[PDB]
From a paper:
In order to depart from the closed nature afforded by the 169a constructs and also reduce the interaction degrees of freedom available to mono-nucleosomes, we wanted to establish whether multi-nucleosome conformation is sufficiently robust/predictable to foster more elaborate engineering approaches. Therefore, we designed a first dinucleosome construct by fusing one of the paired termini in the 169a dimer structure, which yields a (2 × 169) 338 bp DNA. Reconstitution with this blunt-ended DNA fragment (338b) yields two nucleosomes that share a 24 bp linker DNA between them and each have a 12 bp linker DNA terminus. Crystallization yields exceptionally well-ordered crystals, allowing acquisition of a 2.5 Å resolution structure. The 338b lattice and dinucleosome structure are nearly identical to those of the 169a nucleosome pair, with the 338b DNA blunt ends even stacking against one another.
Numbering used by the authors:
A (entry chain R): 30 to 125
B (entry chain P): 9 to 102
C (entry chain O): 36 to 135
D (entry chain Q): 14 to 119
E (entry chain M): 11 to 121
F (entry chain N): 29 to 125
G (entry chain L): 18 to 102
H (entry chain K): 37 to 135
The structure:
């Protein structure tokens, strides 16, 4: 009956199982993965928030996420990230 | 599509202007920074570093310009780019 | 009668004092403007620039370089030189984290 | 068999991300695509680091990733290293590296 | 209806409390803003503004000028330990640098 | 449609300038620098204040978050004065209802 | 004595400072470095602890948490992964 | 016999050893006592989560190791192999930690 503290750890596990099904992760390693997701969430959302504000928009859309991603990630990482983000939105809106 | 760089119109193609960052100008910059004596290797090295600096600020500035759907880079675009790169500038807006 | 001639360093020190008292941009404006336009062509064709955006850029470059030369001057002096060299600039940028 | 994440093809929680964007003081409103895209990117980066760190764990005959494997992954990748250039990974150490002037002759 | 007093005037301030409140609400900082917050923040911005203008004013006077320019602001800030720290990563257009020549570069003989 | 309005802190900057240096004025550019400065410290304070309230599971930015933000952002002597001036203003404001 | 018990700073031993320097690839060490490092470590902890404790007071707590430190490290441009970010 | 490594050789061995491992290098209790001392100047009768003291230790050690790398480069830049206080000073001035 303690706090109820959310984290990305179940999702980190799921991704780990996709990419390396027979490997596991220490709890400190999971903590660092958790730290990482929060850090990059914040960086991206913060830049997106700024992009919208600079442009007098009230809405953060996937286009603000994408520009935020181009500003924030290094070249190759950003091409792939953009590509995975797009693909996910395309796949999401077509689905239903 | 017909027309390539001249698809969008009227002659604005660029030179090799890095040499327009002259030795004397580089020496004035170094003077303001307190430097008394200068190796001959410094001038071409500074041009390199200047170029890298501008590539990075301009890339971000232009990203802000494309996001706003404009074709004109603004002082604010640059200001926002400079802030991002941890090089906050005062006197041009923001 | 020899012509007048300052010894090496004397005019350098004079120039240091001169430019440290002033604030005026030290790179010539037109060449810098072309340079900016040329670099931006790599990211997007047929861009216009507000004049103030170009001035912003020049203000930020010159301040960046004056700052780096300060650090570079310190790196030369740390190695008992008075002459700044590429390896000075390289050390300062490496310590700053600009470079690996 | 639908959940926002499944539609999008993702492991990361689109709904949670959506809620975090909305309550995070970023903007008045958040469009429906934003959390899909954002959760996609977070999963992509998470996958890269885990692919590499999983490899570093294998290379050292271990079945579990530990902070060192994460550090080895990140610091030997030129672009992950830049993205995380002002970040300290606890219990990660540093990369082996000794300046050549300090090595003895041949 | 009573005749209206600015929140600034009740606070004893030159800085716009009401504008600051508005900028806090519309800046995406929190869901709600307390009535004190913009009063406090407006005061702080006034204090810091006053402090820079005090010192730049002195720099202007020292230069035999009536008007503050960017250089006076730069001289003020950089010569002040505390402002220099606050604005340590900030570039002041047309400000220049502080006169500073490293001792080893001065010629043989001293001071 | 004259030419759409652009806010600035310059009337307030001028007012404070007259308190501090009655016979001193200020260039357009210097004014531009002061404007930049005010918006910069606004964002820094408001952002740290935003963070404080978020870490503590609060929806409201109060004078207390402004105060802690100021203590984190400003170096010693500036911070003491600022805390003093913001304490005076709130107190005054509150007593004048 | 008050050499360690109110300059606990001396508990940062010469051996420990060398180990740190070793992990940073340092081969040889001037004897004056151990005092210099102690000054530097203290300034660093002063700055970080000041901010953490400010987070602690604002939360009306008497116990400094890992999150206080993490937030403090982040303000100082010194982001830390693994302790609850 | 006099079997003896030359000056420098054990240093390099130590470098290779500490660069391979990730354990904290400052002893824990002395570090912890330092934290509590420094903290008292800001507020009395403060308590600490253990993970807080560990977070502080991790950050400090990471900081010092990274500062020793830059210091090493500064010594080498001056054609030495021996880090000196003026090397630390120069690293810190260029990093912008000190004026
Ligand atoms: Ca980029
Ligand atoms: Ca000599
Ligand atoms: Ca990669
Ligand atoms: Ca491999
Ligand atoms: Ca006041
Ligand atoms: Ca005053
Ligand atoms: Ca006065
Ligand atoms: Ca700001
Ligand atoms: Ca040990
Ligand atoms: Cl060289
Ligand atoms: Cl959207
Ligand atoms: Cl309030
Ligand atoms: Cl020394
Ligand atoms: K925000």
């Amino acid at each position: 009956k303690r706090s109820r503290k959310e984290s990305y750890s179940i999702y980190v596990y799921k991704v780990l199982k996709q990419v390396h099904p027979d490997t596991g992760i220490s709890s400190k390693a999971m903590g660092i993965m958790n730290s990482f997701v929060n850090d990059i969430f914040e960086r991206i959302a913060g830049e997106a928030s700024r992009l919208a504000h600079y442009n007098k928009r009230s809405t953060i859309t996937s286009r603000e996420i994408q520009t935020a991603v181009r500003l924030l990630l290094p070249g190759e990482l950003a091409k792939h990230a953009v590509s995975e983000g797009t693909k996910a939105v395309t796949k999401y809106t077509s689905a239903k | 599509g017909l027309g390539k760089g001249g698809a969008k119109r009227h002659r604005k193609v660029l030179r090799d202007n890095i040499q327009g960052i002259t030795k004397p100008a580089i020496r004035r910059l170094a003077r303001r920074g307190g430097v008394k004596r200068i190796s001959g290797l410094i001038y071409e090295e500074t041009r390199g570093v200047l170029k890298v600096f501008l590539e990075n600020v301009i890339r971000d500035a232009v990203t802000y310009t494309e996001h706003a759907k404009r074709k004109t880079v603004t002082a604010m675009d640059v200001v926002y780019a400079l802030k991002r790169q941890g090089r906050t500038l005062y006197g041009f807006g923001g | 009668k020899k012509p007048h001639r300052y010894r090496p360093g004397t005019v350098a020190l004079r120039e240091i004092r001169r430019y440290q008292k002033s604030t005026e941009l030290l790179i010539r404006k037109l060449p810098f403007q072309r340079l900016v336009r040329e670099i931006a062509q790599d990211f997007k064709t047929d861009l216009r620039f507000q004049s103030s955006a170009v001035m912003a850029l020049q203000e930020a470059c010159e301040a960046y370089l004056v700052g780096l030369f300060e650090d570079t001057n310190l790196c030369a002096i740390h190695a008992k030189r008075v002459t700044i060299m590429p390896k000075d600039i390289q050390l300062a940028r490496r310590i700053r984290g600009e470079r690996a | 068999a639908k959940t926002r994440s499944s539609r999008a093809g993702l492991q990361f929680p689109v709904g949670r991300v959506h809620r975090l964007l909305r309550k995070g003081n970023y903007s008045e409103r958040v469009g429906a695509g934003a959390p899909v895209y954002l959760a996609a990117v977070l999963e992509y980066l998470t996958a890269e680091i885990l692919e590499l760190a999983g490899n570093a764990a294998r290379d050292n005959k271990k079945t579990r990733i530990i902070p060192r494997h994460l550090q080895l992954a990140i610091r030997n990748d030129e672009e992950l290293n830049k993205l995380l250039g002002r970040v300290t990974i606890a219990q990660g150490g540093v990369l082996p590296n000794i300046q050549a002037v300090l090595l003895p002759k041949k």
